[PDB]
Write a protein that binds this ligand. Structure first.
Ligand SMILES: NC(=O)C1=CN([C@@H]2O[C@H](COP(=O)(O)OP(=O)(O)OC[C@H]3O[C@@H](n4cnc5c(N)ncnc54)[C@H](OP(=O)(O)O)[C@@H]3O)[C@@H](O)[C@H]2O)C=CC1
Ligand SMILES: CCCCCCCCCCC[C@H](O)CC(=O)SCCNC(=O)CCNC(=O)[C@H](O)C(C)(C)COP(=O)(O)O
Ligand SMILES: COC1=C(OC)C(=O)C(CC=C(C)C)=C(C)C1=O
Ligand SMILES: [Zn+2]
Lengths: 339, 133, 118, 114, 198, 83, 385, 83
């Protein structure tokens, strides 16, 4: 262990040495931020070239962030990453099944091997992240596969926390940017005209802070928390609201999903990071599940942050010079649906 | 085990034999999770529900003032004493002084080098002890 | 014309110090003693007021000492006890003055060492 | 006692000036949140103004008050004549820093010196 | 040992008396250092009058302001010691007029007497906190736009209380209380032995 | 390992620093290298070790090799001399 | 008025300058220069550092005239110690002081042209500048930021080949000034860009505390090198290049002349440098020689105390001004009896000059302001300190 | 009311304390003899008027000021405390 000395800011010590395999991610970026702010020792396994992880260097202090070369297929790389970590956090995930990695791999196969080694190593706790409402029978292969994982990893690593976040709201997120980027599309398809798929977003930071707090709290063991949010929404208001802040016309036109799953298939064929995914589409119209579960935010210590509050920052880049100065007050809020 | 500090590591008060109260100053912050002795007990009290009224040193001191005078006035020996009434009660007390000679425990200097905890934990004191022995 | 104020000059509001370090910092006004190593007394002349010592945790990467307290290395020097007390009052720091202790006069005479009976 | 007056002969006259500055800031908060594209709410900001104007509510001496507004006016000038960019303004909100608890038990659990 | 000409210590000394006589309402002390430098000392109210006499007197033309500075003797009731160093290109001599100002007792501004002071007076306010009445535009010059505290005051920590880093979460530079990774080692250097009577 | 037995414990995490990198140490250790040099058998009670090279060496010091049992060692070089 | 700031990254802004300009059309009606972008705390750090360990700071205030800057601190500290440098050292400081004014002027004339748009003069002279730094590096070991001029005397003797090499540089340097002389002194384009721009009247220059080539350019005859001769400037002969009218041309022409006059002073210094010691022989002020500290106890004690504690200069205060290439550079060093200073106000020729930009750049275009900053030779290290 | 301790914080050489100290001199011994276990604490404050602090059971402390009170009033007040 490492006795925590310091005042609490950078150049201080908190005693959490933590491997974080998928740090380069949108959620990840945030996880390393708090861990680094707190003063924790963060080992970031990376596969993308050094150029892309530079954004993580200034976070954390000198000799507090260590970057290791790692390959998912190669078991040895995971082995050495967790050699000297006592906390392992797994954020490995993707939306597009890539040529050399299947949803199973990114969600269930890999995240197993990882926790498996972590145990061999003797890491005190492992945090595994799987998408919210993930039935072993859910339509989207992604969600189901993720469900498959949360089970397995429990056998490789017992009492391994399993936070299960909803789609995340944050700058650089998809949930909010995706819809806002429908601008290019003249019309914005919305299955069931964006109805009956009530959704509860959660700010990225809230998720991050929550995750971090898990690392430094004994109360969470085998817990399957669910960071959800401060307000639910029918996809209709969300879509329009977005377009509202973006100040771009909103033209909700219903599109039969059966045909739309096909549109997802189309972009899905794209070689360079398909923008929409068959598995995405389903997910988007996959209704958010209700909140009866080990609570996440608040329960883990952070009060959720309403979407409207920070939406202005996430959607600003999509506006035009004409609306750049416009502020949240000028715009209207969307409506929640306790349903 | 509730680790505490040592006099190099806290702004506590001590008093020698003629009652001159004196103040240790914090030379080094206490090590590990170890904490100042007064706070461990203020905290245990808050976790118990009888919660000592003092929360900042200056307050623990004000407390010392109500139970005793010397504690708050530093570097100040207390002049008056009441020996005469002490004797009266001594005269009431009847006890036998046993013939066993009264002997100081520190007969020679090896006796002296290691006594308290810090002393006992001293490698320098240990080297001194073996040099004598 | 001058105006009247009985308010102890407190200028804590203008100094620009973070709230935490004005209400939790005790400074001691003391005349420095002499390290017994040297017999010079030129460092036991002026009064100094020194802020209370704070955390000095070891740094993980190089093992250098690291401190989170800004007012640590600051020791202001004041010529007289009255002036130093004034600085604490207007800046709002708590003070606990220690009286100067000067060596008492000691009678010495080389003849004594050759005393018939000492 | 026997002090020379800086700009305000008495707390009364001085308070007049504080009123003016408050108004100034009050009228300005909205503009800044728009010219700096700050992600804050005008109402929220206006409360902050109140916070600061009261953080120094205790001052009783006229001279100290007068300097306080001189300084206050200077800050406004840096924010209406914009020389202070967002990073500077948002700092007022202490958005990134983690708040420290003031509960004794809380401090005991975390810091050697509270 | 430096060569010293007493011609100057006499010339300057005399001038000192001349200034003092001409401006007795404000001159408190007038000394010449052993380094042949005059240093009339004036009551703070004499800032405007003493300077003006030196800027515009045939027998003492002191046209340019070399510098305006404020030492801070914390012990001294009047903390700051505003020092104005002036040069006379006509008589090739410099003089220093030094006054005393406390934190909340402002000094007059001489921007009128010398416009050079427009900037230095802003510099003294930013670093030490002395205020100058009738200044055209007094505002921080050297410190950051949002800086709180006057830095060159002897009571201000060197490292200060705030430092800046870029935070990704908020994608903007953000102050945090200073946390230093090797505190300034404060070597004690004074020797316990004096050098001479001085 | 290092000159002073600086070896991070099997559980310390600064060992992560050495992961995928070389922990810099020097094979040539002084404690040993001085030993190799033999004791100089001078024939005068007090000899001086200028440090070798005069101005390019260490401050000059005189050593008393009078103690028959032990050998004088320059506080600077560590070189030993015996009478 | 379309407020526009000359932001720092722009090349003409010397790296750090935020001139809030009010553009009344292209004509600029007001400038409010926002310096402070390079304030390092140089004068609050010096209070915590001994007199020798604060010398280095003075090489970084104006970073283009290093040694002349460290000749102002060296003269100050020396005054407060009533000690004088040995004769050879004083000539070496005058030799290095004029190499620095040639070095600053090559900096000021060529970078001004870089701003106006002439690019070749910078390249030709900058090769002549590395020839010069070499002289710094060969005498101190640092191309710039030498630390050679010490509070008492200078640090080490000149290497045995430097004065021959300084002759060869000075012998051929004047043709190099002559060459930019032809390329940028009669070009109608330069004259038009520089002549009648930023005229400053004589009394206004004294009142604004300009004190430099800006003072001399408008015809006021003031050189601290002849008026108040510091070091040996009493035994070297030179002509101050007083300009007549004050336009940015007359100021350029003056800067080109001072480079020529400095070659006249450098010539005299090589011709008449005395045999002798380079640092005063008082071990109390200047550190003892390497051989002496390793063979004599009084010298080791003096080396140990001087490096660890300090000179302990006698209590007093002094304002010492030397003619730095930019203008009058002065240090007001207030000293308690302690080995570390109490206050060190660096008067920067430049704090006064930048103040003059608003008055000097009056009724002038956006382009004229680029010339106005160029003709003040402002380095923000000295202004920001 | 369980009485655990009584503290008489008299102030030496103080005008008011005269009564308190007189009590100590004349009746302290007696009180102790009577109550030979109870701890009666004679302590010496300064620049404070005398206070007869009493600690009752379960950490409750009560205060009776003795400023400028006669010797028997001090005796009566003390007797009222241990009822
Ligand atoms: N809206 C959301 O973001 C939600 C996310 N989640 C879960 O949270 C986790 C983090 O999400 P997010 O950050 O958006 O995901 P990202 O798409 O940002 O990717 C996360 C990280 O996983 C790494 N990664 C992906 N595939 C592989 C692979 N085959 N081998 C090695 N590394 C890989 C990536 O590294 P690289 O880029 O270098 O390949 C990346 O740094 C995910 O696992 C997801 O299941 C759950 C609910 C909502
Ligand atoms: C969004 C951006 C936030 C920026 C907020 C703003 O710029 C910062 C700022 O308030 S600038 C300092 C204001 N501070 C004063 O102006 C002094 C007040 N002076 C008093 O408060 C006195 O104590 C008094 C006797 C008047 C109490 O009377 P009262 O309680 O005010 O009524
Ligand atoms: C000579 O004066 C100065 C310049 O202008 C010619 C600058 O460009 C710069 C900075 C320029 C760059 C972009 C290297 C500095 C520091 C300077 O001192
Ligand atoms: Zn040797």
């Amino acid at each position: 262990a490492v006795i925590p000395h310091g005042k609490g800011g950078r150049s201080s010590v908190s005693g959490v040495v933590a491997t974080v395999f998928g740090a380069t991610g949108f959620l990840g970026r945030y996880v390393v931020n708090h861990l680094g702010r707190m003063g924790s020792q963060v080992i970031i396994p990376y596969r993308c070239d050094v150029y892309d992880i530079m954004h993580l260097r200034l976070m954390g202090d000198l000799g507090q962030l260590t970057f290791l070369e790692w390959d998912a297929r190669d078991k040895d790389s995971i082995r050495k990453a967790v050699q000297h970590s006592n906390v392992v956090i797994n954020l490995i995930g993707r939306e597009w099944e890539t040529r050399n990695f299947d949803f199973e791999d990114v969600f269930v196969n890999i995240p197993r091997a990882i926790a498996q080694a972590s145990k061999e190593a003797g890491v005190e706790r492992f945090i595994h992240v799987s998408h919210l409402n993930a039935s072993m029978k859910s339509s989207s292969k992604s969600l189901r596969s993720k469900a498959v994982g949360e089970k397995e990893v429990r056998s490789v690593f017992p009492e391994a926390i399993i936070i299960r976040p909803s789609d995340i709201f944050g700058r650089e997120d998809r949930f909010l940017n995706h819809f806002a980027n429908y601008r290019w599309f003249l019309a914005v398809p919305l299955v069931s005209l964006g109805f009956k798929t009530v959704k509860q977003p959660v700010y990225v930071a809230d998720v991050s802070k929550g995750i971090v707090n898990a690392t430094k709290d004994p109360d969470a063991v085998g817990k399957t928390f669910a960071f959800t949010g401060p307000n639910r929404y029918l996809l209709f208001h969300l879509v329009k609201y977005i377009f509202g802040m973006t100040h771009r016309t909103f033209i909700p036109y219903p599109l039969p999903l059966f045909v739309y799953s096909w549109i997802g298939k189309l972009f899905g064929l794209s070689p360079f990071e398909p923008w929409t995914t068959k598995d995405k589409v389903e997910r988007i119209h996959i209704s958010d599940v209700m909140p009866t579960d080990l609570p996440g935010l608040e329960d883990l210590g952070v009060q959720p942050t309403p979407l409207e509050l920070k939406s202005i920052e996430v959607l600003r880049r999509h506006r035009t010079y004409r609306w750049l100065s416009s502020e949240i007050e000028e715009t209207k809020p969307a409506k929640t649906v306790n349903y | 085990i509730l680790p505490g500090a040592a006099y190099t590591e806290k702004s506590a008060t001590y008093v020698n034999t003629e009652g001159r109260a004196q103040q240790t100053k914090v030379a080094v912050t206490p090590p590990g999770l170890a904490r100042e002795d007064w706070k461990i007990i203020r905290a245990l009290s808050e976790i118990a529900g009888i919660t000592l009224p003092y929360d900042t040193l200056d307050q623990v001191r004000n407390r010392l003032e109500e139970v005793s005078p010397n504690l708050v006035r530093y570097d100040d020996i207390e002049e008056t004493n009441y020996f005469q009434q002490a004797s009266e009660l001594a005269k009431l007390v009847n006890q036998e002084v046993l013939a066993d000679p009264l002997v100081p425990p520190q007969l020679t200097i090896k006796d002296f080098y290691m006594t308290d905890s810090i002393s006992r934990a001293s490698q320098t004191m240990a080297k001194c002890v073996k040099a004598v022995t | 014309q001058l105006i009247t104020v009985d308010e102890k000059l407190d200028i804590t509001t203008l100094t620009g110090v973070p709230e935490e370090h004005i209400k939790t910092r005790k400074v001691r006004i003391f005349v420095p003693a002499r390290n017994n190593m040297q017999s010079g007394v030129n460092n036991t002349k002026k009064w100094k007021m020194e802020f209370d010592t704070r955390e000095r945790w070891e740094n993980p990467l190089m093992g250098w000492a690291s401190t989170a307290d800004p007012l640590s290395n600051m020791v202001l020097t004041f010529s007289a006890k009255e002036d130093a007390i004034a600085f604490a009052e207007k800046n709002g720091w708590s003070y606990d003055v220690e009286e100067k202790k000067v060596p008492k006069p000691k009678s010495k005479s080389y003849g004594a060492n050759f005393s018939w009976n000492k | 006692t026997s002090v020379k007056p800086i700009f305000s002969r008495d707390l009364n006259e001085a308070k007049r000036r504080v009123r003016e500055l408050y108004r100034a800031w009050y009228r300005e908060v909205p503009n800044t949140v728009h010219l700096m594209q700050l992600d804050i709410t005008v109402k929220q900001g206006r409360d902050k103004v109140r916070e600061m104007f009261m953080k120094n509510a205790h001052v009783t001496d006229p001279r100290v008050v007068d300097l306080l507004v001189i300084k206050g006016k200077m800050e406004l000038q840096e924010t209406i004549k914009v020389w202070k960019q967002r990073t500077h303004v948002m700092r007022f909100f202490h958005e990134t820093e983690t708040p420290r608890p003031k509960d004794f038990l809380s401090k005991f659990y975390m810091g050697h010196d509270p | 040992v430096r060569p010293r000409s007493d011609v100057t210590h006499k010339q300057l000394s005399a001038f000192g008396e001349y200034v003092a006589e001409i401006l007795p309402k404000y001159v408190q002390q007038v000394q010449v250092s052993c380094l042949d430098e005059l240093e009339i000392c004036i009551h703070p109210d004499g800032v405007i009058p003493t300077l003006t006499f030196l800027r515009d007197h045939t027998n003492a033309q002191f046209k340019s302001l070399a510098d305006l500075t404020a030492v801070d003797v914390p012990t001294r009731q009047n903390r700051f010691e505003i020092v104005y160093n002036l040069l006379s290109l006509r008589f090739n001599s410099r003089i220093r007029v030094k006054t005393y100002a406390d934190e909340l007792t402002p000094i007059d501004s001489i921007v009128s007497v010398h416009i050079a002071a427009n900037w230095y007076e802003r510099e003294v306010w930013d670093m030490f906190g002395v205020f100058f009445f009738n200044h055209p535009d007094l505002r921080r010059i050297l410190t950051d736009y949002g800086f709180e505290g006057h830095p060159f005051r002897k009571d201000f920590p060197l490292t200060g209380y705030v430092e800046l880093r870029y935070d990704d979460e908020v994608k903007r530079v953000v102050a945090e209380p200073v946390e230093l990774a090797q505190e300034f080692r404060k070597f004690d250097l004074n020797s316990p032995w004096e050098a001479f009577p001085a | 390992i290092t000159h002073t037995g600086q070896v991070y414990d099997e559980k310390d995490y600064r060992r992560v620093r050495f992961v995928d990198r070389q922990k810099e140490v020097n094979e040539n250790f002084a404690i040993d290298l001085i030993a190799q040099q033999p004791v100089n058998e001078v024939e005068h009670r007090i000899i001086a070790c200028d440090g070798g090279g005069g101005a390019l060496g260490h401050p000059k010091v005189y050593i008393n090799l009078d103690k028959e049992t032990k050998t004088g060692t320059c506080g600077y070089c560590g070189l030993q001399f015996k009478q | 008025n379309m407020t526009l700031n000359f932001g720092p990254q722009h090349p003409a802004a010397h790296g750090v300058l935020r001139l809030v300009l009010e553009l009344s059309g292209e004509m600029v009606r007001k400038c409010d220069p926002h310096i402070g972008l390079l304030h390092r705390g140089t004068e609050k750090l010096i209070e915590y550092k001994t007199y020798l360990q604060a010398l280095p700071y003075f090489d970084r205030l104006d970073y283009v005239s290093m040694m002349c800057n460290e000749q102002a601190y060296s003269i100050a500290v020396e005054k407060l110690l009533n000690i004088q440098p040995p004769p050879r050292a004083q000539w070496i400081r005058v030799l290095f002081g004029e190499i620095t004014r040639i070095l600053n002027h090559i900096m000021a004339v060529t970078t001004h042209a870089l701003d106006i748009g002439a690019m070749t003069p910078f390249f030709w002279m900058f090769e002549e500048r590395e020839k010069m730094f070499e002289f710094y590096e060969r005498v101190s070991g640092a191309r710039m930021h030498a630390a050679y001029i010490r509070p008492g005397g200078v640090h080490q003797d000149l290497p045995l080949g430097l004065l021959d090499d300084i002759y060869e540089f000075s012998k051929n340097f004047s043709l190099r000034i002559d060459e930019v002389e032809e390329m940028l002194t009669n070009n109608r384009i330069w004259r038009n860009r520089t002549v009648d721009i930023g005229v400053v009247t004589a009394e206004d220059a004294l009142n604004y505390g300009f004190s430099g080539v800006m003072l001399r350019g408008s015809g006021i005859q003031w050189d601290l090198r002849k008026t108040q001769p510091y070091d040996v400037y009493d035994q070297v002969e030179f002509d101050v290049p007083i300009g007549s009218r004050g336009d940015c041309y007359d100021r350029y022409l003056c800067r080109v002349e001072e480079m020529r006059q400095s070659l006249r002073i450098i010539e005299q210094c090589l011709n008449k440098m005395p045999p002798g010691e380079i640092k005063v022989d008082d071990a109390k002020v200047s550190p003892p020689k390497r051989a002496e500290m390793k063979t004599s106890m009084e010298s080791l004690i003096h080396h140990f105390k001087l490096y660890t504690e300090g000179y302990q200069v006698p209590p007093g205060a002094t304002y010492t001004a030397i003619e730095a290439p930019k203008g009058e550079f002065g240090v007001y060093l207030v000293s308690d009896g302690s080995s570390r200073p109490y206050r060190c106000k660096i008067k920067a020729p430049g704090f006064a000059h930048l103040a003059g930009l608003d008055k000097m750049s009056k009724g002038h275009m956006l382009a004229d302001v680029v010339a106005i900053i160029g003709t003040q030779d402002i380095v923000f290290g000295e202004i920001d300190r | 009311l369980g009485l655990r301790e009584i503290r008489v914080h008299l102030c030496q050489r103080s005008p008011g304390s005269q009564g308190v100290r007189d009590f100590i001199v004349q009746r302290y011994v007696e009180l102790k003899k009577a109550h030979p276990n109870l701890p009666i604490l004679i302590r010496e404050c300064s620049e404070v008027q005398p206070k007869l602090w009493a600690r009752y059971a379960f950490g409750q402390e009560k205060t009776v000021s003795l400023n400028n009170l006669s010797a028997d009033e001090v005796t009566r007040a003390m007797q009222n405390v241990l009822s």
